[PDB]
């Protein structure tokens, strides 16, 4: 009813949102996406319950899926209606007059049921009464609680709870009624589901949370470490004031790294672009938490290491199957050390010279099937690997692959010994492999399978994934121990060492 109350609550809600934003970075986001502020803490977000009405943009409601067959794309909020908006608090709060009427009706029904069951030579059913569950201003949901006999002794706890302000040094917002005494009057269970599905579903929310940066499909069963070992060390060591602040500033860094894609966009935080010291991650606006987290994850020339790993894996794969590919020489140029994270691939990664001739078709993407090898005939071939870090809006690998191939191949600065070849691209944040350009006859499925196999179990990529899992405190979903022993009993001699007590 009170318009002033709504205005003030929205104003202070925006105040706290701006406080969080300035905590993230000194400047102010141009767009300030609302996925971060409303994703529940179970999914790794602030999960701010709000009484306002903010319509989530459809541009941020899309998500992708890098399936083996192809890169599928979906949009949860594609319905032809009003734009998806996070539901407000009052949408799931019972009216007070409705609360009183329901309390009266349910208590009358409970009294009638008790009177009927008195003659049943037994206690109340407590099962058919479930039709009146979670109702009534008194704790009718707790009317069957075990502590009721213990609770019946207390009389007039309301005054004690009120005077707790003079007793307890901390403010008690729930002084209207005591928890586990008048019961949980407000049912807030559907709110979480409504908020998560209205934000774009679980997958839609996770699409901007670096979840695709972990190869394990830990959609369910994953463990998120709220407190790490450093927290225990700080608690035990009796840290100083600055050390206490540093220990308390850990979860902020944690989820800000966990929210890197949607927080490092281009439309959000407009200004001068900047990349790290020796990597290929572009950040808009100085974010000390994200900067320090990124330089921890990419410590010790990790970008150059993963580039060398992928180029060596490609070279080994090509050498192994050099028979059908008519490969005479498969080598790599004297690549400058800084040319791994460079914006433009001025130096070619892998060169492959065949024996006499090599038919190459027109450039295309790996999803294509048609091929006309008579387009060109060259004796050389080039393969380039593009190490890129996809954002929440620039994660389109196929479009990025096309644009990058067109720019690099058609450029004066870039020097390619062969005019015919294919450029490969790996989105580290998306962990998505793609390629674009010409192909060797019959090598396109071979290159696709090789890329999939390498990206499955690349050493440096696995190390980077483990680093991400540790830094974000997302522990891998725990495996299930073979509690069964019928097979173990037969294979008891097979076990090297076993004992029972």
């Amino acid at each position: 009813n009170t318009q002033e109350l709504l205005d003030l609550l929205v104003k202070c809600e925006n105040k706290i949102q701006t406080r969080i934003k300035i905590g993230l970075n000194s400047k102010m986001p141009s767009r300030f996406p609302p996925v971060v502020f409303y994703t529940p803490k179970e999914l790794g977000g602030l999960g701010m319950l709000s009484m306002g009405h903010v319509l989530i943009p459809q541009s941020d409601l899309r998500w992708s899926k890098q399936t083996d067959v192809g890169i599928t794309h979906f949009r949860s909020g594609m319905s032809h209606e009003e734009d998806q908006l996070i539901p407000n608090l009052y949408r799931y709060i019972q009216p007070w007059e409705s609360e009183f009427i329901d309390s009266q009706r349910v208590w009358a029904e409970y009294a009638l049921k008790r009177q009927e069951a008195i003659a049943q030579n037994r206690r109340l059913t407590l099962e058919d009464l479930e039709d009146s569950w979670d109702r009534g201003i008194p704790r009718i949901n707790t009317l069957f609680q075990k502590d009721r006999h213990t609770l019946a002794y207390d009389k007039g706890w309301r005054v004690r709870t009120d005077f707790k302000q003079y007793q307890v040094l901390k403010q008690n917002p729930f002084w209207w009624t005591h928890q586990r005494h008048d019961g949980k009057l407000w049912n807030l269970n559907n709110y979480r589901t409504d908020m998560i599905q209205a934000l774009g579903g679980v997958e839609g929310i996770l699409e901007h949370t670096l979840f695709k940066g972990t190869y394990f499909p830990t959609w369910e069963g994953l463990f998120w470490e709220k407190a790490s070992g450093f927290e225990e060390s700080m608690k035990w060591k009796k840290l100083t004031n600055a050390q206490r602040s540093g220990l308390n500033q850990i979860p902020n860094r944690r989820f800000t790294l966990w929210w890197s894609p949607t927080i490092n966009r281009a439309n959000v935080y407009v200004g001068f672009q900047v990349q790290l010291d020796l990597t290929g991650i572009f950040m808009h606006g100085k974010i000390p938490t994200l900067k320090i987290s990124l330089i921890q994850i990419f410590r010790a020339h990790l970008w150059q290491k993963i580039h060398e790993s992928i180029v060596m894996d490609l070279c080994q794969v090509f050498d192994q199957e050099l028979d059908a590919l008519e490969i005479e020489t498969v080598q790599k140029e004297t690549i400058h050390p800084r040319k791994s994270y460079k914006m433009n691939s001025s130096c070619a990664d892998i060169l492959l010279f065949a024996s006499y001739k090599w038919n190459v078709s027109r450039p295309s993407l790996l999803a294509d099937s048609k091929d006309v090898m008579d387009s060109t005939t060259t004796q050389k071939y080039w393969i380039d690997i593009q190490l890129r870090w996809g954002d929440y809006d620039s994660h389109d690998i196929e479009r990025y692959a096309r644009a990058k191939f067109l720019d690099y191949t058609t450029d004066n600065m870039s020097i390619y010994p062969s005019p015919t070849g294919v450029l490969i691209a790996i989105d580290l944040a998306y962990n998505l492999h793609s390629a674009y350009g010409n192909w060797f006859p019959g090598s396109k499925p071979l290159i696709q399978q090789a890329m999939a196999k390498i990206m499955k179990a690349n050493p440096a990529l696995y190390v980077l994934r483990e680093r991400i899992r540790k830094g974000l405190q997302l522990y891998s979903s725990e495996p299930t121990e073979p509690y069964l022993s019928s097979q173990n009993y037969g294979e008891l001699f097979s076990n090297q060492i076993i004992w029972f007590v």
Binding site: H301, Q304, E308, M312, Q316, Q320, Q331, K332, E333, T334, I335, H336, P337
Partner: peptide
Amino acid sequence: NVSQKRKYRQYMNRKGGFNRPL
């Protein structure tokens, strides 16, 4: 089916050449 050892380039702490050896 066998795989010969895989070699790598020592770009770090290499004063022999500015570009990585091939």
